[PDB]
């Protein structure tokens, strides 16, 4: 506040006063409706069956939690999950695999013999409180 | 600093229920019905799951602490002052805390009743990878003493296990005074130069 | 259940040599056994058209452990014991004995 008048606060918050006609259950459902939901939060298991034939075949099976479980915990429908995977996730996955192929062919390995960067008042720091 | 024979009897009787508290809380966080034994193989496997997670250990520590601190509050409420041998105005230790001359009823209770649960950085006593809080205690021990709950008082003395745990909590405060980069010097200097 | 022993041989005869998981070989090549004279150390050596086999006994294991191999009978219930040394065998290829200049630039 006083010293930096930061526009980028560490913990930005909003206090929302709820009405009387909105119940404790309705308010908790509303909390879920605004809270950010990630794909990670609805996935239980991912099974990748890498099989090489003819072409690298990658069978990615997304085992999510039960439909009624994540719909009651995140207020997310199956339709909402379909749109995100078919539009965002696959485009994001394809870009990540392409980037990993380029990174593999770019640098074949670290340079041998060439030095790399290191990993990581003296009496004053050893002075006790009475000193 | 002395309690009467009557007052000291109350102290031992309330602190006698504290032995069960350790396992009771351990059985509550772990979610096990009929209150399973302290040496139960399923319980010991369940407490290991808690040991490996910082959040799970936090739930265990906060539950056990609230339960043992409730036993502490009971001892203090019963024994002080209705159980003290010498009483106010003659009990100068009691008088100084009540007058506001020096000290409080909390310091008085650590002297005459018990030190209580030794809290370290909001939680209980630190535990090793083996599940032991000290080489003296059993791995995954479901006891209040093992967690840092000191039944001993400064008048009667404190056991070596309690002594080491008190040393931990005592030092913890001095460590915080050494690692505190926050200073009000520059904050005030910036205001005073613009408001002079 | 006490099992009786028929014969014990303290002389060299049969030997065991560990290679790696999934070792087949041509199964027509020979392995020459060697001995040194408290505890005797053994050396194994074989030869092939494309490969070469070399084996030896571990110095720390020989003086401390004594390995024996036996044949069991299902009716007589008697075992014929023979001392067998364990030889840590490695296989060298035709690609070996390849090297560049001792000093490069």
């Amino acid at each position: 506040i006083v010293m930096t008048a930061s526009a980028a606060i560490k913990t930005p918050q909003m206090t929302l006063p709820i009405w009387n006609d909105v119940s404790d259950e309705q308010a908790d459902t509303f909390c879920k409706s605004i809270s950010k939901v990630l794909l990670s939060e609805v996935i239980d298991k991912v099974i990748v069956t890498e099989t090489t034939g003819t072409a690298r075949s990658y069978v990615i099976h997304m085992r999510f939690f039960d439909n009624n479980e994540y719909s009651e915990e995140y207020d997310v429908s199956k339709e909402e999950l379909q749109n995100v995977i078919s539009n965002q996730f696959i485009h994001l996955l394809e870009a990540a695999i392409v980037k990993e192929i380029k990174k593999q062919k770019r640098t074949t390995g670290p340079d041998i013999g060439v030095a790399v960067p290191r990993l990581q008042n003296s009496k004053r720091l050893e002075e006790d409180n009475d000193e | 600093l002395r309690l009467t024979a009557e007052g000291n009897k109350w102290r031992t009787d309330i602190l006698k229920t504290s032995v069960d508290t350790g396992r009771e809380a351990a059985a509550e966080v772990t979610n096990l019905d009929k209150d399973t034994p302290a040496d139960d193989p399923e319980l010991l496997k369940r407490l290991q799951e808690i040991l490996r997670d910082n959040n799970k250990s936090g739930i265990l520590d906060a539950v056990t602490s609230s339960k043992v601190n409730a036993i502490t509050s009971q001892v203090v409420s019963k024994c002080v002052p209705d159980g003290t041998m010498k009483k106010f105005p003659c009990n100068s230790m009691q008088a100084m805390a009540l007058s506001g001359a020096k000290g409080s009823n909390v310091n008085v209770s650590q002297i005459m009743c018990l030190l209580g649960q030794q809290a370290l950085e909001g939680r209980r006593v630190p535990v090793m990878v083996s599940g032991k809080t000290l080489p003296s205690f059993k791995p995954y021990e479901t006891d209040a003493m093992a967690g840092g709950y000191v039944k001993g008082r400064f008048y009667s003395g404190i056991k070596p296990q309690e002594y080491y745990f008190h040393c931990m909590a005592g030092r913890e405060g001095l460590i915080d005074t050494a690692v505190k980069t926050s200073r009000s010097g520059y904050l005030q200097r910036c205001l005073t130069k613009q408001l002079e | 259940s006490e099992i009786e022993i028929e014969s014990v041989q303290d002389q060299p005869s049969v030997a065991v040599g560990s290679f790696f998981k999934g070792f087949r070989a041509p199964s027509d090549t020979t392995f020459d056994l060697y001995k040194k004279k408290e505890k005797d150390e053994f050396v194994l050596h074989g030869e092939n058209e494309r490969l070469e086999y070399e084996g030896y006994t571990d110095s720390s294991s020989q003086a401390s452990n004594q390995y024996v191999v036996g044949l069991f009978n299902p009716e007589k219930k008697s075992i014929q014991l023979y001392k067998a040394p364990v030889l840590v065998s490695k296989v060298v290829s035709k690609s070996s004995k390849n090297l560049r200049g001792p000093k490069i630039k």
Binding site: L38, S40, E41, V42, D44, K45, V46, I47, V48, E50, T51, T52, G53, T54, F65, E69, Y70, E73, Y74 | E28, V29, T30, N31, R46, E49, N55, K56, I59, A62, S65, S66, K67, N69, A70, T72, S73, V76, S77, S104, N105, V106, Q117, A119, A169, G170, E172, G173, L174, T177 | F20, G22, F23, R24, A25, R50, L51, V91, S93, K94, S95
Partner: protein, 124 residues
């Protein structure tokens, strides 16, 4: 020997190259020029499952056998001492202890009200 996605020579033990990178019908080891394949190696598969710790969520936390979340209501302060409340006048008052400043400096007590829930900090 063939193990999962890997293929090793039965003669020397050197890891054999992928059949896609080298020429068709036949494959050979870098160490010994051994005759391969036997055509029984097949189009191998490797079932790789997620880390289980990979997706930390509120639902995954609820799937754990032990208590992972504390009740909003069931929250008992850290202990209670019989101290006069400065807010109005109450008997039950919660507390907290720690040793601040020097080893010569006294013990600081952090009081907490029950009727209103007002924090405090007083040394003596």
């Amino acid at each position: 020997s063939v193990v999962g996605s890997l293929i090793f020579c039965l003669d020397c033990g050197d890891l054999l190259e992928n059949p896609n990178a080298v020429l068709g019908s036949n494959v050979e080891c870098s160490q010994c020029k051994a005759i391969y394949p036997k055509s029984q190696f097949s189009n191998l598969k490797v079932v790789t499952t997620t880390a289980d710790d990979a997706f930390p969520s509120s639902l995954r936390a609820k799937k754990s056998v032990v208590k992972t979340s504390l009740k909003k209501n069931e929250l008992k302060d850290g202990a209670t001492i019989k101290e006069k409340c400065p807010q109005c006048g109450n008997e039950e008052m919660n507390y907290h202890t720690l040793q601040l400043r020097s080893a010569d400096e006294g013990a600081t007590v952090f009081y907490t009200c029950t009727s209103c829930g007002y924090k405090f900090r007083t040394n003596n």
